[PDB]
Structure formats: structure tokens, C-alpha cells
Symmetry: D3
Subunit: 233 residues, 6 copies
Amino acid sequence: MTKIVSHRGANRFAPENTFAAADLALQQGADYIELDVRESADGVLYVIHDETLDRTTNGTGPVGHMLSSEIDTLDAGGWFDDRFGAIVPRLDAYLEHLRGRAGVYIELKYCDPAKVAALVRHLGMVRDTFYFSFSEEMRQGLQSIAPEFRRMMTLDIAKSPSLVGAVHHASIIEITPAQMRRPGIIEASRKAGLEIMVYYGGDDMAVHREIATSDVDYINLDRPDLFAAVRSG
Amino acid sequence: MTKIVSHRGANRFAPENTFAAADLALQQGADYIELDVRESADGVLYVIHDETLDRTTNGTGPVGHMLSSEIDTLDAGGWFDDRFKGAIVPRLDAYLEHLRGRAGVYIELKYCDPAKVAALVRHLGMVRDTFYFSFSEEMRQGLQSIAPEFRRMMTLDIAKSPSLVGAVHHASIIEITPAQMRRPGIIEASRKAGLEIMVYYGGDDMAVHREIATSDVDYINLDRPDLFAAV
Amino acid sequence: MTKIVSHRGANRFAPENTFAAADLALQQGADYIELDVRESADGVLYVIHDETLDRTTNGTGPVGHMLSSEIDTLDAGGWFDDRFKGAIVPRLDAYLEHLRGRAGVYIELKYCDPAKVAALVRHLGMVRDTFYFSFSEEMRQGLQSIAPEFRRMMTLDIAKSPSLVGAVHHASIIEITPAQMRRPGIIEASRKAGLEIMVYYGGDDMAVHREIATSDVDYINLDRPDLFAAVRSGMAELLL
Amino acid sequence: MTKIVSHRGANRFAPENTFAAADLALQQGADYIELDVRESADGVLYVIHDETLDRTTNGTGPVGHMLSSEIDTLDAGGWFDDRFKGAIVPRLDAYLEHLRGRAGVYIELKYCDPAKVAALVRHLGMVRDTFYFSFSEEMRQGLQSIAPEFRRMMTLDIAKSPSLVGAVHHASIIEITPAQMRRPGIIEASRKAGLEIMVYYGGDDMAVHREIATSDVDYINLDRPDLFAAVRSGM
Amino acid sequence: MTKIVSHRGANRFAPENTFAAADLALQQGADYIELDVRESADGVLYVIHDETLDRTTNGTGPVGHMLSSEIDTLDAGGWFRFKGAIVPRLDAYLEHLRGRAGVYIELKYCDPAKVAALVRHLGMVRDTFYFSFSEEMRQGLQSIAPEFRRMMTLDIAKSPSLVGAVHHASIIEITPAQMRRPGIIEASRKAGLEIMVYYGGDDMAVHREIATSDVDYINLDRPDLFAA
Amino acid sequence: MTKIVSHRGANRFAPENTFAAADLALQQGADYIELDVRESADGVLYVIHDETLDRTTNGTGPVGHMLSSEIDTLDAGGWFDDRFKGAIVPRLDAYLEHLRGRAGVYIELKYCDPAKVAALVRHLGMVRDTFYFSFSEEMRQGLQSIAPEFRRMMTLDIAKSPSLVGAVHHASIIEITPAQMRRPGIIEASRKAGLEIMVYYGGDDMAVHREIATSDVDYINLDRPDLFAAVRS
């Protein structure tokens, strides 16, 4: 049965990357929660997609340039609705809060891979966690510090299912719906012994079904509720 | 339920690292089969333990100095029982193709070329059902560089602590002696670490076998598949 | 005398990267066959240049997304000429075996598993007569830690300086444009560095071929073995 | 002015590797404190020398097979004296925080997770006033790839030459025996390489201490802070 | 106290990357002399910024394609009282500066092994730090000389806590705008980093700002002003 | 034909690793000169085998602990014979300078800075005419990381199989013993692996010399060039 990976939490009904967005996703049936990591000017791990506070908080400028004390005081939920001054979660709490409740797909944006390794190791969440990053710097870093961690590569970058493990040292391959459909793509990913996650952040119930129907291990989506119902069938 | 890992195949009643010994262990309920691998003078991958041929074949000297053509000649069963005269020193090549689909494989690199092992396993598509280890640092470094994604294991005697099996030795699997399986905190520390757990037994004591089947262990490295299957 | 490196076979008279373009190249006096490698969806090493099958086959899309079983189906000659209707997309497998004992091979990795390439060559015993290159930094580093000892080359365009081919790029062979060949100190620096020199041309100006054949150059990476071979035979006589 | 490095603390008057030993050393004049890092079965960084609890605690067996829960239960002081019956096995956690701002710290990894150490140190902002070493190659290489910016030392016995401390061992500090210190070439060669100089001793000969203080050395890896402390003052 | 790093000498008063621009700046109170290094076709280190000879020489083309011999010929003073000024070999330039100042070496494109050997030989490790916009040059030197001092700009590291943890540098460089921002210097100090500020701006009003700030180095293009 | 590798120089007629012992070797027709490098306390690369200055000089103590200034002033010939009174321990600097153009150089690192070696050989343009080795894994890993290009040898004793001389020890040259040279499959395997072959002897049983010279061997690591040389003529 395909597991649900919630892309930045219950994105459509709660401020992305918030305990609320996260808690909501767990309610709608998400099996995993995806988050994005960044580091404050003073070395603290936070959950936030953008490089700057602007788009999703009461603050502005590079998160890398701000100290945590200030960051910990920003509003990260009012921009969505007044019903939400949610905090820019610290990977510290955000993870401890998720531990035991779900798996976490951690995507490094820019931070210290060592701190991530040390933390995940401290919490004992190695098995139930997997990594990725568009930053080559981050991948190599995490690849050198934590080879044993589960990581994933996109077919888009790997060029071939056979190279996801061989070249990108990953055990999970992310493919689009178009790639999911191509006959050999799944058989190949399977020959390579990869878990398979398909990315789709839309509303087409049909697409959700077709995925819940295919030989796929995960779905990285922006609407867990929909896929959860389709999985109901 | 604990999975069975046949150490050198059912060697108590068959020649170790032989198709016979392996098919035997397989028939006695083995879930995985463990191999020993070395490379010939001319780069061929063989399933043999000792560095030399003397002990388990009718040949002599270092395996690294004999051509594959001469090796495929030797008898790898005679020394054991007369009932084993044909017994060849299997080629990792053919040995894995055979097991491919009948069981899992635990490949211990004695001394060879990691690249050829990774090329081989990736071609047979046996990445998910195999794991590695070596007492040679050189071999582990090579394999670690060539195939980080590969599942591997470290023993507790080397890692010093379960918290270091993955963190320091990049292992996903931890192997422990039955004694260590007894220490209350060891199995728990390993689970905290998220490692798979395997115990090396291969004894006669059917009680220990039942004790391990009882504990929260994932695999049991064995010399007597027969016994454990019953339990 | 200068050695000839056939750029993806005698491509001007045969479908590039094809057993046909290669045999032609051999018959025409080439000492090395240059070939491009990519990997199928299921990990089979193939000889083909483009990322997609569209141009040199009757198939379409990325090769990385198609299973070798269907790939072996395609026709890699038909597009060049009716004479080549059933040319297959060579499996590095067969190709290298067919070339072993017949020529040297210059293997350019486009995108594939370095481990498989190194493993295959070590098995055929072809490490002395093959050299590598790749435009993909990822492929280069992969092969650099997997096969530090293989023979490799770097372009001056990338190395910036002959002295950096081996120093920074770990290569023992430098590739140069005809223009850089003419620069007085380039061939000399490369010589001080202990590098083998290769000039990439592949045009059809007889003058250039004769010039190159006349310079202090070890190899000529070209598109027309027929031309350079003539010029070279001419040199051979004088050599007598 | 030669700075003093207290090897496992004032181990000559207090149970080694305990806060008691650390504060005592601080008082005898210590500039730096030396620890040894091990790791519990569940990944908690502890300050204890031996691979086994036996010799310096009321616990027995490998430190790596025991959960922090039980370790935090041991008596790392009683064996030394009744005055210290209380003593606990210091978690690198708190031990470091307690020293931060009060003294420099020489961290010697026995066997543990380099990553856990590098993260802890960065989080505590103690990068600068701290330096590392280890006799485990596995440990040094682990730390070398994870934290190459850290300050670290190499013993001459291993580096063979002073010009190889940095070039081959990537170290910034060279440890020298009082003997090797005497050779006029050793010290000058070290300085040429831009190295810091530390002399390991831990002996009680006021004779030696005087000489070391005499020499052109930066640190002295001591076992008797009081002795050299007195000698330094006089100068 | 804040030290002065001369961005390839007093490039404003004398031909950049020259013994002249080095002496002048050194005389004006400069503490360090920043220099740009490239390698000739026959492998000789040379101080010159651009990849091509043109801009600051009577010779043309890439430096990488010219033999040291012919390069030694060129005059890198003309284009600026100076005329016979030569393109300095890192050999002489480094020996010439030893004992008189620190040296900030910025690798443009060359062999890190040659640089490390040279600096190790000359006993100049402690008084020198590195950088390079080239990932290749940085990884090369990082693997060859982990111990050398190096800097990463905040522009690239994104966070002060990442200058050492990710780019393995002990020196962080920043702009004045960044210098002005509160918690930046603070975070930089927590990471135990040395702080350098780039500013080739004559606004003597900012030179005053920097001076009063908690900086360690000032990589200026006009030493004189800051010296005042 | 077989190239001659003068192991430490003409051993029975001139103090090992000396200018005198090298020039003498060249006369007996040596093609290559094997050296042993060690670094002086102050960073100078010298040519000397032992870790200490005892056995081969009038000085004493580990070479690494003595400054170059001093070492330069020592006597490396008197120990051998009054004839070589004054022989100096050769800096790899001038020793390579002196050999460039007249011989191949087998540079065996004992314990020094691989970068210093690397830079030197690069500057003197002697990359093609030299190959390397070291029993020290520490030295081998460093040279390997700094100069993968350099040609290097590995003994079959260590590689366990000619097929691993390249694949694992990244070397193109395999040094074997006469004993192994006699074993059938060996030399052939080495050829299948495209390896250059070198045999170590240093003995004086001139029968063997010819056995080696009549074998498919490219190099001979000798103690007596004079002998093998004449067997060559």
C-alpha cells in the first residue's frame, strides 16, 4: 500500500512547514512528512523552504543572516490566515514531535550536514528517515558524513534508474507521473532494488488513483486527504 | 521471525562454499547464504574462504596466483567426503545467478576487486537482497567508495558500540555474539540506532538456537540450518 | 608515426557508433576507435552519443529510460542509408570484444555507471590500449576514484594549461585544437609535462591533415581516417 | 608564557576525568583541561579514558555496551577516595559547558562519533579554544573529513619530522617529549613550520618542569599542574 | 586591532600585482598583500589577476599558454612612471614579502601542490590564508593542505555558522552592509572566525565605520585612507 | 630488452644512495636508479634509506629530527671506505637534477611530504621517467591523492594477485620475485592486466640474472648492475 509523504505538511489548509500544517497532515492520513532544512546565522536548525524569511514569515532577509533568538520570535502562520503566530520550527522540536508519529523526508536546502546527522542519530530516527537536496554541496557533505542514511535521487537527475544507486548512491528514486506510466521505468527501478516515490501535487482524483494503483511505494503530494480517500477504496 | 543465514552453506554435512552445501542449506530452510570471495590471478571472482587452495581443494598455494582455467579444474569436495568428487570451486559469477531468486546473499569480501563485485551484483539486480562485510580495511574502504548504497554490516567487537556501527562504520546491520545478545541494553541500543540485528551461532546446542529465535534478532549466522528451521 | 583515433567510427560513410562505421574505420587504417557510452534503464552499457535515441535510431526519447530489450530492437543505421537498414545499437559488451585484438579504444563516458565500465575493461584485459575522457564532471570523478590508473585525457580548453592536465586533471594525455598545436610552446610544455598529444580535427582540408602529420603529435582524433591514412603512408615512404 | 594543559585533570589529587579533578586543576593554575571521549551504547558522549568502566568506576565492562541511563548511575570517584564517593562520569555535554569560558580544552577522541563531537563543539561555539588528537586512525580521519578546520596536534613520534606535522597529519600543534625538546633542531624546525609546541610530561621532577618552562614551548601536557604552576610564577 | 589587506597592492597609485604596488602599499601601512595566482604552460606560478595577458601586459592571450621564459619578458607596468615592471613569479614575490607582511593568496587557476610546497618551503604557513572562486581549486587545496588558513565569503557560505562547518574556512569575509547588520559579527564570533571586510571604496566615512567595528581585517583597494 | 634498476646504486662499490654510487651505476649500464626519500626536520627532501643517520653516515639520530643545514655537512662515505671520505647525503633536489636526462628514477618514499615530491618532479619535468612505491600506506595514500597520474608499482606480495595491482593498489607496475617469475600463470596474468613487470634480485648468481633477462620481464631491481649489464651485452 502506497505511503503518503506530505510535501511541507498539509500545505493547502495550513501554513507550510508548521506544526499545524504537520499535525493536519498526520490527521489526513500522511505516513511521512517532508520538510526543508536551513541554518540560522548562529548555527541552529530550522524548518523553512525559502532562503529568505519574506514569503512565509513576519520577517525579511536571508535566514542564514539572522540569529535564532530573533527567528524564534517571528510569525510563520499569520500570512496564511489569522486563525494561525505559529513558529518557524526548530528541527529539534519539529522532529521530536514527529518521532514515533510518522516518517520524515528531510530535504537539506543549506545547513550543516553534521548537525543533521548528529541530531537524527541522537533521536534514533535513522531508519525512518530519508534525504535529498538540490545542492550538490549538501549531498556530497551528507554523503561523506552519513553514507548509511536512506537518500533519494530523481530520475530527472539520475538519467536512468540504474544510476540512482550506482552514481547517486540513493536507495529511493523519485519519478513523475509521466515516468511512472512508462512501462520499463518501474520494472527497471525494481531491478535496481529501489523504493519508488512519485511526485504529484495536484487535485486530479484520477491521477491519485492511478498512482495508488501502480507499483509505487510512496507519493509526495500537496493533498494527503485526496490520496488517503483514494487509498480507502 | 528470525531469518536463517547459512555460513558457507550447510557445511556440517557438505563441502563449504559449494553448490551442494548451498542447495543443502537452502533445502533446510535457509533465507540467506553467506559467501567468501577471492579473485584469481587473472581477475575472476571465486567463492572460497582460505587465502590458499590447500585446505578446501586438491590444489595448493595462493588463489591469487592461479589462473581461472586451472582453478575450475580443482576438486572442492574430496577433502570432505568421497561422496563429493566433482565439487568445483564456484565462480561468484555462476554462484549468484543460481541463488538469484532462491535466497538472499551475504557476501564477505576476503580479498578481491570491489568494482567487479558491484558491477556483478548490479547486473544481476541483487542489490536489495545482499549485504557485505570484510575484515580487511582495504576492502571495506574500496567497497565503501564504490557502493555506499550497498547494505553492509559491522560486528559489535569492532564498532565498540552500536551507536557507531552506522555512524563510524557506515553499517546498516550489526552482528553480535549470543553473549552480547544477552546484555539487556545491546539489543535496545541497536534498535535505537535502527540497525538490523544478526547473531553468529552455528553450534549444536538446540537451546541457544531457541534462545535466539526468542530474542529480538533479525538474522542468525549459522553452520546448522537444520536445527534452527525446526525451532 | 601518428596514430589515428576514429571519432565514433568512419561516420562520413557509415552510421556513427555502429559495427559498420567501425569496421570501415579499421579497414581504412585507424589505430583507435573512439566510442560514446550511455546506460539503458536496466543498466546495460550501450555505444551511442546523444542522450536521446531520436537522431541515430528509429526509437525515441532518453536511452536511460528504455530497457535494453527494446534497445536491442532499434535500428541504428536506417537513418544514414538504406544500406544500413538493420544496424544495431552496439552493446559496449560486444563492441569491445570485437575491437579487442583489432584496435585501441578511446572510451568517452556520456552518462553511465563507471564501475561497470572499469569492470568490463579489466575483464577483457584492455587497460593498456584504452584511454578515457568525459565532459561530465560527475563521470570523471567517479572514474577517477574507481579507476585512478586507467589512461585518461583532458582538453587544453578545460585544463587551461598543459601543466594542469596531469596536475589538476590527473590525465596523461592532452587533447588540442589544430590552432593550439601551432602555438610554439604548447607542444613543448606538453612534452615537458610528459603528456601524450592528440589533435582533434576531423575536417577534410588535406593541408591540415598533412600539417598535423608533420607536427610533434601522437594522435589525431578525426572524422575521416581515409584522408589522414593517405598522408601518413606518404610519410612512411620517406621514413624508409 | 607557557600555557598549562591538565592531562585528565589534577588526576594526582582527584579522581581522573571528573569535575572534581577539573576544578582542582583549574585552581592549581591550569590554562587547558584534557579529556578522553568514549561513547555509550546509545550514543551519548562521555568523558572517560579506558574502554572499560572497571578501573575508574564501580561499574564493569565496555563503556560502549552500557546505556547512558546506567552510566549516569556509576561512581567515578569512590575508587580514588571516600572524599569523592559522589563523583559521576561527566557527560561531554555538561563537562564542556562547565569549562567554556573558564579554560581551553584538549579533546582526545578514544572511540566515538566524530560527528556528534563536531556538532556539540560548534553549537557551544568552542571551536577556537579547543584542539583535537587521537591514537585511532579511524577516529582522526573521521574527524579530519568532518572537521578539518578544527585545531589538532600530532606527536613527533608519529609525524617523524616537524615538517610533516602539518603536511602529512594536517596538525597545527606538535607534541614533543622533554627529550625531543632539547635537540636545538626540533624546536626551531617546528617554529619554521608555523606550529604550536606542546611538551608532554606529567612527571614530578621539579627539575624537568623548570627546563620545560625554560624552553620555547607553548603548552605543556602535565599531570601535576601545581608543580609547573609554581615554576612558571617564579619566571 | 584591525589589519590592512592590500587588494593586489595600491592598484590605484601603482600597477596592480607588481613589486611596486606591493612596496608602496606595504609602505603605506598595509599588513597583508593580496595576490592572484595563475600558472604558465610550463608550470611556473605567476602573480596576475586576469586569465588573459592583455589588460595588464604588452603581451596577449591566455597566461596558461605561454612559456615562463616569454612571460618573464613582458612588461606589466606600462599601461599604468613604471614600464619595465615584470609579472612577478610567486617564487620571488613570496620570498620578497616574507617577514615584512602577511599574504592573502587567491588561487585563480593553477596547481595547488606547487603552492603548498612553495609556502611550506618558505615557512610561510602561519602568515598566510587562501581562497578561490574555483570549486576545483578549492577542493584541490582543501585535500592537499587542510591545515592552511582559508576564507569563505558570506555571500557563498550563506551563514557564518557554515563558513567553517561547510567551507572549512576560519576566516569569513563580508560586505559593509553585512558588517552593519547586528547579529552577523556576533554569529561570526561565536563560530570563532576571523572577520574580514571588503571595501575598495574611498568614502573615508566608511573606512571610519569599519575601523570602529569588531573586524579583524580590511581588504581595501586604497591602504592610505584606512591607515589614517 | 630489460631495463636495469639500480637498487640504491652500485651497492658493492660505492656507499648506497650517493652521487658516487649513482654515477658508478650509470657506468655499469644502469637504466634506472632507485632512491629512498626522507624529509629533514626543516622540510628538505634527502636521499637515504634508514630512519636514522647511524648505519650510513658519521652522524646519528633520526633524519627527521636533524636540520638540513647540519645534515648537508655530514659524511656519507667514510663508513663504506676511506675512498668515499666526504660523500654527502644527497638532497633529492640536486640528485634528481643530476639524473635528469641520464636515467629513469625509481622514487621510493620512506617518509616525507608527498606534495614536495610531487611538486619537485613536476617542476623538473620528470613525470614520464619515474615511478613510485612505499611500504608506508600513509605515504601511498597521500601520493595517490596528490598524483594519481604518476606511475607506481606494487609488489605481488601485497597485491595478492596481479589482477589487483591496478584495481586495488592503483599501480601499473608489479614487482615480483624470481620465484614468482618462474610460476607459469603469473607473468601472463600481469600481461593480461597490462602491467609492466619488474623482478627483484640483487643476488650475484649470474645464472639467475640471465634467467631474468631471458624472461618476459621489463625491469630488474639489482644490487649488481655490472653483472646483469654484461649478461646483457
